[PDB]
Homo-oligomer: A and B are copies of this chain.
Amino acid sequence: RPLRLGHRGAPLKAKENTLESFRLALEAGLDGVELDVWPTRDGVFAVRHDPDTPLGPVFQVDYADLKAQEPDLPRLEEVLALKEAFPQAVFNVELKSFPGLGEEAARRLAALLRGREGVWVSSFDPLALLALRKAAPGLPLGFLMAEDHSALLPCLGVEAVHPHHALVTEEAVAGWRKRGLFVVAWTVNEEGEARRLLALGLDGLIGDRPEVLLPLGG
């Protein structure tokens, strides 16, 4: 059935991108979660949406320092470790990096996720995706799109396309299906829109409300 994914966990039940949020999303019965990561100065993947912190941009601060300042800030490995409690859960890691520093971060993430199962990486940065695919041939990837940049799909090594829900139309989906892509829309928080998207045959939905996603599928 279509994947029901918790955006940054269950952001309305607990603070977004925190271990509690991810746990609550999985305890709610969702198929998995999406989590945002940025590389720290010392190469740790901090789980948070915004790149700017009280101590400066994430890439210029060591993880331990960000953690002292923000005690509930998880590192990637801690979130993926939840697969121990939920063996069937999947994790969509969105690699966020300043395009220009994306290739280096991508190579680092590739090494960290080597051979790991139940995880796929998505990114809005085509350059990071190319670097990821070269560094880890077996790691599933998804191309995030805020505007319709489908023209790049033929040149990207990705198994999925993650379009903003407003880009999802019958014709757009036909194009993605034509390439055998797995389609995951975001960020879907309304029943009406969720049903519209599923009626189009999408493979997954990322949303902030578990209740809305749970009944979808079978």
Contact = CB atoms under 8 A, between A and B. Distances in A.
A130 to B, nearest CB: 6
23 contacts: A98-B98, A99-B99, A99-B124, A100-B124, A100-B146, A103-B147, A126-B126, A126-B127, A126-B152, A127-B147, A127-B149, A130-B149, A130-B151, A130-B152, A131-B147, A151-B155, A152-B152, A152-B155, A152-B156, A153-B155, A154-B154, A154-B155, A155-B155
Interface of A: 98-100, 103, 124-127, 130-131, 146-147, 149, 151-156
A98 B99 CA distance: 8
A98 B153 CA distance: 21
Contacts of A146: 100
A130 B127 CA distance: 14
A162 to B, nearest CB: 15
Contacts of A152: 126, 130, 152, 155-156
A156 to B, nearest CB: 8
A155 B129 CA distance: 15
A130 B103 CA distance: 20
Contacts of A147: 103, 127, 131
Contacts of A100: 124, 146
Nearest to A153: B155
Nearest to A147: B103
A158 to B, nearest CB: 12
A103 B130 CA distance: 20
Nearest to A96: B100
Residue among A98, A99, A146, A149 with max Cβ neighbours from chain B (10 Å): A99
A98 B124 CA distance: 12
A91 to B, nearest CB: 23
The 4 closest A-B pairs by CB, nearest first: A99-B99, A155-B155, A152-B155, A126-B126
A205 to B, nearest CB: 22
A131 B146 CA distance: 12
Contacts of A98: 98
Contacts of A131: 147
